[PDB]
Design a protein around this motif. Structure first.
Motif, PDB file in Angstrom:
ATOM      1  N   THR A 192       6.405  -1.327   7.098  1.00 12.82           N
ATOM      2  CA  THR A 192       5.943   0.038   6.884  1.00 12.82           C
ATOM      3  C   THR A 192       7.142   0.965   6.758  1.00 12.82           C
ATOM      4  N   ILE A 193       7.062   1.908   5.824  1.00 18.34           N
ATOM      5  CA  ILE A 193       8.086   2.929   5.633  1.00 18.34           C
ATOM      6  C   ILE A 193       7.408   4.289   5.589  1.00 18.34           C
ATOM      7  N   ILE A 194       7.858   5.197   6.447  1.00 21.93           N
ATOM      8  CA  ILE A 194       7.428   6.588   6.426  1.00 21.93           C
ATOM      9  C   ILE A 194       8.629   7.442   6.047  1.00 21.93           C
ATOM     10  N   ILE A 195       8.470   8.253   5.006  1.00 28.12           N
ATOM     11  CA  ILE A 195       9.515   9.169   4.578  1.00 28.12           C
ATOM     12  C   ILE A 195       9.135  10.570   5.034  1.00 28.12           C
ATOM     13  N   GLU A 196      10.102  11.476   4.950  1.00 29.80           N
ATOM     14  CA  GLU A 196       9.913  12.869   5.333  1.00 29.80           C
ATOM     15  C   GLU A 196      10.162  13.836   4.188  1.00 29.80           C
TER      16      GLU A 196
ATOM     17  N   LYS B 101       0.843  -1.189   0.000  1.00 32.18           N
ATOM     18  CA  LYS B 101       0.000   0.000   0.000  1.00 32.18           C
ATOM     19  C   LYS B 101       0.881   1.243   0.000  1.00 32.18           C
ATOM     20  N   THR B 102       0.454   2.276  -0.721  1.00 31.76           N
ATOM     21  CA  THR B 102       1.169   3.542  -0.793  1.00 31.76           C
ATOM     22  C   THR B 102       0.206   4.692  -0.525  1.00 31.76           C
ATOM     23  N   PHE B 103       0.704   5.734   0.139  1.00 33.20           N
ATOM     24  CA  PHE B 103      -0.130   6.859   0.560  1.00 33.20           C
ATOM     25  C   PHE B 103       0.657   8.148   0.372  1.00 33.20           C
ATOM     26  N   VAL B 104       0.360   8.883  -0.695  1.00 29.02           N
ATOM     27  CA  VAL B 104       1.006  10.165  -0.952  1.00 29.02           C
ATOM     28  C   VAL B 104       0.188  11.239  -0.246  1.00 29.02           C
TER      29      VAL B 104
ATOM     30  N   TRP C 180       3.984   4.668   3.656  1.00 30.36           N
ATOM     31  CA  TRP C 180       3.439   5.986   3.946  1.00 30.36           C
ATOM     32  C   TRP C 180       4.420   7.041   3.454  1.00 30.36           C
ATOM     33  N   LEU C 181       3.937   7.915   2.579  1.00 30.55           N
ATOM     34  CA  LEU C 181       4.760   8.897   1.887  1.00 30.55           C
ATOM     35  C   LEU C 181       4.356  10.281   2.369  1.00 30.55           C
ATOM     36  N   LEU C 182       5.312  11.014   2.931  1.00 28.21           N
ATOM     37  CA  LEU C 182       5.063  12.332   3.499  1.00 28.21           C
ATOM     38  C   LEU C 182       5.658  13.390   2.582  1.00 28.21           C
ATOM     39  N   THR C 183       4.865  14.412   2.267  1.00 34.35           N
ATOM     40  CA  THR C 183       5.294  15.444   1.343  1.00 34.35           C
ATOM     41  C   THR C 183       5.215  16.818   1.998  1.00 34.35           C
ATOM     42  N   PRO C 184       6.185  17.703   1.747  1.00 36.46           N
ATOM     43  CA  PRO C 184       6.010  19.105   2.153  1.00 36.46           C
ATOM     44  C   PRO C 184       4.969  19.817   1.301  1.00 36.46           C
TER      45      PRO C 184
ATOM     46  N   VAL D  34      -0.682  11.225  11.031  1.00 37.83           N
ATOM     47  CA  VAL D  34      -0.727  10.001  10.238  1.00 37.83           C
ATOM     48  C   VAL D  34       0.509   9.155  10.504  1.00 37.83           C
ATOM     49  N   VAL D  35       1.675   9.795  10.611  1.00 40.33           N
ATOM     50  CA  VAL D  35       2.898   9.051  10.901  1.00 40.33           C
ATOM     51  C   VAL D  35       2.785   8.347  12.246  1.00 40.33           C
ATOM     52  N   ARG D  36       2.314   9.061  13.271  1.00 45.74           N
ATOM     53  CA  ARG D  36       2.198   8.464  14.597  1.00 45.74           C
ATOM     54  C   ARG D  36       1.220   7.297  14.596  1.00 45.74           C
ATOM     55  N   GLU D  37       0.056   7.473  13.970  1.00 47.27           N
ATOM     56  CA  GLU D  37      -0.939   6.409  13.991  1.00 47.27           C
ATOM     57  C   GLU D  37      -0.504   5.219  13.146  1.00 47.27           C
ATOM     58  N   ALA D  38       0.252   5.447  12.068  1.00 48.36           N
ATOM     59  CA  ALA D  38       0.802   4.329  11.306  1.00 48.36           C
ATOM     60  C   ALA D  38       1.868   3.589  12.106  1.00 48.36           C
ATOM     61  N   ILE D  39       2.707   4.330  12.831  1.00 48.76           N
ATOM     62  CA  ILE D  39       3.697   3.694  13.693  1.00 48.76           C
ATOM     63  C   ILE D  39       3.000   2.809  14.715  1.00 48.76           C
ATOM     64  N   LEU D  40       1.936   3.326  15.333  1.00 46.12           N
ATOM     65  CA  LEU D  40       1.189   2.519  16.293  1.00 46.12           C
ATOM     66  C   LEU D  40       0.499   1.338  15.618  1.00 46.12           C
TER      67      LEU D  40
END
Ligand SMILES: Nc1ncnc2c1ncn2[C@@H]1O[C@H](COP(=O)(O)OP(=O)(O)O)[C@@H](O)[C@H]1O
Ligand code: BEF
Length: 389
Positions: free
Chosen positions: A317-321, A222-225, A348-352, A232-238
């Motif tokens: 799971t991978i969260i980027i910054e 699964k991917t999430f842009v 999980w993909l995090l974008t500025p 979202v990062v915290r809840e995905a970590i949990l």
DNA sequence: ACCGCTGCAAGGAATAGGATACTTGCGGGCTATATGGCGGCGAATACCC
RNA sequence: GGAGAGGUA
DNA sequence: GGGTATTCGCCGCGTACCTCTCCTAGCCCGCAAGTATCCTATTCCTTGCAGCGGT
């Protein structure tokens, strides 16, 4: 004129022929406790036939990550040690170098043959001993980074060379490694080709092979842009912690990563975090890699050394910054690095801010989001062609 | 008083961005092959002795 | 200043 | 040569006024403007040599 120096159209080479015993190779197949996919079997047949031919190889096996490409190399190395041809392996890192080291040790803890590593982790005192041993030929399997291509390693009979992740390698690396002996079998392992290599594969001047057959249990990722949200990062970590897994945190900084580790610890007090960067003395790096093998701490902050990948099935799971400057090959490779298990992974993909994004970053992100499925790396490489050119 | 260590530069893979060489249409500045009008008259040939 | 066209007596 | 006829070429064809338009052609060289390209930075990784505590 340069080719006239060689006096041939790259054709002065005669090559080499390997001898394979079908029963011995079948025994090694028995020592492999798995069943290969049909395209993996086709690749095995192609490579074994090509090495049986009296000519040297230059064969691309460009299949998507998670397809067990390394086992093709394991069997190639087994047939190399059957001929005792002093096989060497190259990878642009130390983490995946150690991964290949232990994998080969597992494959050959039953077969009597010598496997070892030569890199920064080894002390020069034993590096000289390794070079002496590979000069006398008492070593058949070597794993190491560019130390070998420093005009220092000596081979009694260099007969097999292996290269992993051709991307991130500059030109003349392959020429420097080819200079030693022309008729050596070149096995080019990779996950995704750079545009020039992909075009050359299209030309047919180099042998090519594709493995579009994922393992049975390798479900999609699964991917999430998403825009920059701290929740979202915290809840995905949990979500993965309750699952019992490991989170890959990407920030791409060696100065603010220190502050960011404690920042995301405050954001996620439930998280146990280690700090990782390539500018460290490597002792704690290997120690915390071992810790990751034991999953004593959940989420790891790291720079792009994670890209080579030693993924454990626990990690899901991978969260980027930073999502504004990253090549499509890297994006897809880190997407697919997760898994090797029956459990649905995540990316999980995090974008500025969207307005801070340049046009090309928008194109890269929209392209990676558009495609999300198995067998997506090759098509993404085709799209990257005409993009990077 | 000798040594292996840390650390500090030199050279590879990924992005943004101005400088600047290159290409082009112009604006003014310059140089250089006919066919529907008569009439009068005087000079110039033509002519045939 | 010179050409071309039309017009008036 | 000599008297004659025939042809060729030049000369000429009303005065006065009003309205309108248009007035050399073509090359060439500096030159303004607009552009694709080349050098300029940032981030990652892996080397090679000089200091340097330590004994
Ligand atoms: N056909 C298969 N069925 C089940 N599991 C597989 C199969 N092929 C590979 N695997 C597992 O998936 C993992 C993939 O690791 P790796 O060989 O590094 O793949 P890649 O090189 O494509 O990243 C292997 O460790 C192996 O245990
Ligand atoms: F080389 Be891989 F993708 F493990």
């Amino acid at each position: 004129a340069e080719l006239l120096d060689i006096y041939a159209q790259r054709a002065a080479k005669e090559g080499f022929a390997f001898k394979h015993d079908r029963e011995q190779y079948q025994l090694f197949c028995d020592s492999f406790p798995f069943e290969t996919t049909p395209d993996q079997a086709q690749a095995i047949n192609a490579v074994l036939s090509d090495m049986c031919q009296p000519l040297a190889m230059d064969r691309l096996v460009c299949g998507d990550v998670g397809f067990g490409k390394t086992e093709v190399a394991m069997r190639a190395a087994f047939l190399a040690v059957d001929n005792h041809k002093q096989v060497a392996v190259l990878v642009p890192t130390t983490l995946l170098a150690q991964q290949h080291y232990d994998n080969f040790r597992d494959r050959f803890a039953n077969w009597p043959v010598r496997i070892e590593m030569i890199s920064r982790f080894r002390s020069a005192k034993e590096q000289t001993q390794i070079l002496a041993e590979v000069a006398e030929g008492k070593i058949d399997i070597l794993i190491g980074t560019h130390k070998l291509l420093q005009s220092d390693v000596k081979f009694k009979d260099l007969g097999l060379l292996i290269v992993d992740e051709e991307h991130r390698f500059g030109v003349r690396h392959k020429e420097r490694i080819k200079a030693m002996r022309a008729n050596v079998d070149i096995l080019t392992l990779t996950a995704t080709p750079i545009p020039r290599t992909l075009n050359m594969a299209m030309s047919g001047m180099r042998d090519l092979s594709i493995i579009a057959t994922p393992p049975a249990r390798r479900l999609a990722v699964k991917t999430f842009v998403r825009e920059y949200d701290s929740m979202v990062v915290r809840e995905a970590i949990l979500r993965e912690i309750l699952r019992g897994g490991q989170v890959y945190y990407l920030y791409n900084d060696v100065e603010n990563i220190q502050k960011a580790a404690e920042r995301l610890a405050e954001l996620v007090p439930e998280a146990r975090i280690a700090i990782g960067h390539g500018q460290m003395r490597e002792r704690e790096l290997e120690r915390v890699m071992n810790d990751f093998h034991h999953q004593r701490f959940n989420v790891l902050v790291c720079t792009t050394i994670i890209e080579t990948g030693i993924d454990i099935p626990t990690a899901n799971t991978i969260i980027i910054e930073r999502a504004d400057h990253f090549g499509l090959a890297q994006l897809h490779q880190l997407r697919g690095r997760v898994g090797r298990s029956h459990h649905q992974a995540y990316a999980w993909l995090l974008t500025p801010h969207p307005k801070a994004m340049t046009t090309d970053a928008q194109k890269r992100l929209e392209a990676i989001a558009s495609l999300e499925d198995l067998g997506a790396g090759f098509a993404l490489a085709t799209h990257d062609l005409e993009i990077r050119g």
